[PDB]
Amino acid sequence: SEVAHRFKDLGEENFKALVLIAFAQYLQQCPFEDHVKLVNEVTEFAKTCVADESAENCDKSLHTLFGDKLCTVATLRETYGEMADCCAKQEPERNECFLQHKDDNPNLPRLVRPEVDVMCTAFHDNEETFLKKYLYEIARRHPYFYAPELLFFAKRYKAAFTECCQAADKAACLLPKLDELRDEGKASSAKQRLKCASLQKFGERAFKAWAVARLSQRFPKAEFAEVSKLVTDLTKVHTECCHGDLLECADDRADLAKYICENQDSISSKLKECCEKPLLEKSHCIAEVENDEMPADLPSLAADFVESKDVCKNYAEAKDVFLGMFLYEYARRHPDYSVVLLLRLAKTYETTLEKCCAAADPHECYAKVFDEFKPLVEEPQNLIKQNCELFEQLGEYKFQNALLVRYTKKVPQVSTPTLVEVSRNLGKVGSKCCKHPEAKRMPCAEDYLSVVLNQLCVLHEKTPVSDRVTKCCTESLVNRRPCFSALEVDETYVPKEFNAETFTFHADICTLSEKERQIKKQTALVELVKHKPKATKEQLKAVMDDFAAFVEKCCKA
Numbered sequence: 001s002e003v004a005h006r007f008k009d010l011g012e013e014n015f016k017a018l019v020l021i022a023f024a025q026y027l028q029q030c031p032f033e034d035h036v037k038l039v040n041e042v043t044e045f046a047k048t049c050v051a052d053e054s055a056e057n058c059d060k061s062l063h064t065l066f067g068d069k070l071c072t073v074a075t076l077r078e079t080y081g082e083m084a085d086c087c088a089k090q091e092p093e094r095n096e097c098f099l100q101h102k103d104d105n106p107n108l109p110r111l112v113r114p115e116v117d118v119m120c121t122a123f124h125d126n127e128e129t130f131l132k133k134y135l136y137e138i139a140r141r142h143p144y145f146y147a148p149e150l151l152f153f154a155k156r157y158k159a160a161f162t163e164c165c166q167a168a169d170k171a172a173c174l175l176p177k178l179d180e181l182r183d184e185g186k187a188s189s190a191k192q193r194l195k196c197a198s199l200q201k202f203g204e205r206a207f208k209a210w211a212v213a214r215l216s217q218r219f220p221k222a223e224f225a226e227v228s229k230l231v232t233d234l235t236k237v238h239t240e241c242c243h244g245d246l247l248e249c250a251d252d253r254a255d256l257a258k259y260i261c262e263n264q265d266s267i268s269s270k271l272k273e274c275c276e277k278p279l280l281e282k283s284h285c286i287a288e289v290e291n292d293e294m295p296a297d298l299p300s301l302a303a304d305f306v307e308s309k310d311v312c313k314n315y316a317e318a319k320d321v322f323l324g325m326f327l328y329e330y331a332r333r334h335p336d337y338s339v340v341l342l343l344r345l346a347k348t349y350e351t352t353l354e355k356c357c358a359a360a361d362p363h364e365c366y367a368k369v370f371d372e373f374k375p376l377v378e379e380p381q382n383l384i385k386q387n388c389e390l391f392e393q394l395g396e397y398k399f400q401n402a403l404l405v406r407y408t409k410k411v412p413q414v415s416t417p418t419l420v421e422v423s424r425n426l427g428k429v430g431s432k433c434c435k436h437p438e439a440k441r442m443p444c445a446e447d448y449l450s451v452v453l454n455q456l457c458v459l460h461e462k463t464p465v466s467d468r469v470t471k472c473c474t475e476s477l478v479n480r481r482p483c484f485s486a487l488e489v490d491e492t493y494v495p496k497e498f499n500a501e502t503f504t505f506h507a508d509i510c511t512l513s514e515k516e517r518q519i520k521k522q523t524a525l526v527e528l529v530k531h532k533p534k535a536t537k538e539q540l541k542a543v544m545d546d547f548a549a550f551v552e553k554c555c556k557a
């Protein structure tokens with residue numbers, strides 16, 4: 001009984017949380033109550049299997065088991081049309097179909113949170129359901145949220161209430177903590193969405209290269225065979241979480257935190273504070289631990305990778321390992337480079353070897369490969385410098401607007417909401433990274449940009465309208481950012497005419513949150529640029545201002 005095993009390892013509480021998260025991520029439109037019923041029903045079943053490891057159907061894979069309870073509510077086609085086609089399928093296909101149906105932009109009501117009092121009463125009255133509702137709401141809106149970590153957020157959510165409700169000014173104590181949480185949860189969801197996209201659209205080999213680079217940067221002292229071990233386990237974890245095998249992912253993720261803390265000494269002298277913590281805070285702390293100090297006596301890379309004469313042979317013998325070693329070595333000594341840049345470099349090296357080791361004067365051919373790296377390293381450098389400069393002088397809002405204009409002109413066909421969100425996110429990269437000194441700017445900026453452009457790529461892939469987005473999103477995971485940066489203006493784009501129905505003006509615009517005014521004016525700016533692609537940085541201000549001024553007078557007259 002697979003359930004039995006997982007049950008013993010996670011216990012009842014966490015086991016019940018993971019199953020709810022998994023159902024909420026599969027049937028996103030399904031009501032809360034309905035889910036809870038299925039969960040209990042499944043939990044008890046696991047309980048009867050905990051005793052007689054051969055009852056009714058305890059010798060069934062989780063997929064088989066969960067794929068059945070869901071098909072006892074999804075059958076209702078009038079409710080989840082396509083979902084049903086899935087249940088008519090067999091296994092393991094029955095599972096794939098569901099995964100093909102996860103919705104990155106579920107049409108749902110924005111979670112409005114009542115006054116502090118209503119919440120505190122609800123929390124105090126019944127803690128388990130309050131907590132469960134949170135898990136369900138987050139899970140259905142982010143069908144790829146890293147389950148293990150969602151458990152950690154739930155703990156932080158509980159602790160927020162546990163204290164604010166008891167204190168003097170609850171309002172001022174709760175909101176801040178929940179703001180902090182709403183943001184961090186969106187961030188977390190976006191990063192994980194990139195990991196699943198990597199695994200699902202490009203293959204585990206791409207995910208593995210991403211982890212080697214990232215871990216080597218974080219554990220410069222660790223040994224390649226060690227990093228490689230960590231990378232292999234980490235791959236399985238995410239492979240499972242992304243595929244919906246939430247129980248094993250959580251279970252497997254515990255082991256990794258276990259393993260890493262035991263071997264603390266030979267990995268990083270920074271895990272200390274992480275390892276003397278509870279399970280969930282442990283997993284979490286390790287994932288975000290800062291880079292260790294770089295081993296002081298590290299020989300030039302040129303030695304073993306360009307000057308040596310055994311390059312082609314070692315390459316020939318096992319290119320994967322040799323390429324992995326190149327990345328690990330280059331990465332460990334460049335915590336100042338972004339993970340994607342290191343991957344582009346590793347890609348340039350592999351490409352240079354493929355050609356060079358074919359000619360009969362190898363060493364001479366691949367002798368100046370590091371000169372091919374210079375251009376690749378300064379492009380991101382210039383990009384960041386130029387954009388952080390702009391950011392400093394304009395501030396977040398004005399910067400987001402400049403980006404809205406930039407991107408609408410690049411890919412005008414993209415839906416106004418996606419453009420607005422993506423561009424605001426791109427603007428937050430300016431706020432999060434330009435702060436840092438040049439040494440920490442690139443990993444901050446470019447890896448954050450990869451996360452944000454990944455959103456654009458999954459939102460657009462649902463309803464493709466720009467072959468230019470499609471091309472930049474599917475050609476290569478690592479060159480996405482450079483691909484988008486290179487686009488200027490779509491010259492074949494035919495402008496849109498007018499339509500007052502395109503942008504209603506319901507007076508409810510002097511009543512909405514300040515933040516929501518901006519999002520309205522930005523939604524207007526995008527529509528404006530779509531009508532006048534050729535308009536200019538001069539006239540665009542003229543129509544935005546007057547437009548702002550317009551809503552000013554109007555609102556107070």
Ligand SMILES: O=S(=O)(O)Oc1c[nH]c2ccccc12
Binds near residue numbers: 191288
């Ligand atoms: O700032 S980063 O550390 O680069 O953010 C991260 C990206 N991918 C990650 C996987 C595990 C832990 C942290 C991660």
Ligand SMILES: O=S(=O)(O)Oc1c[nH]c2ccccc12
Binds near residue numbers: 388
């Ligand atoms: O090619 S872009 O997407 O315009 O590059 C960028 C968008 N937002 C950024 C913030 C900081 C540095 C570079 C940025």
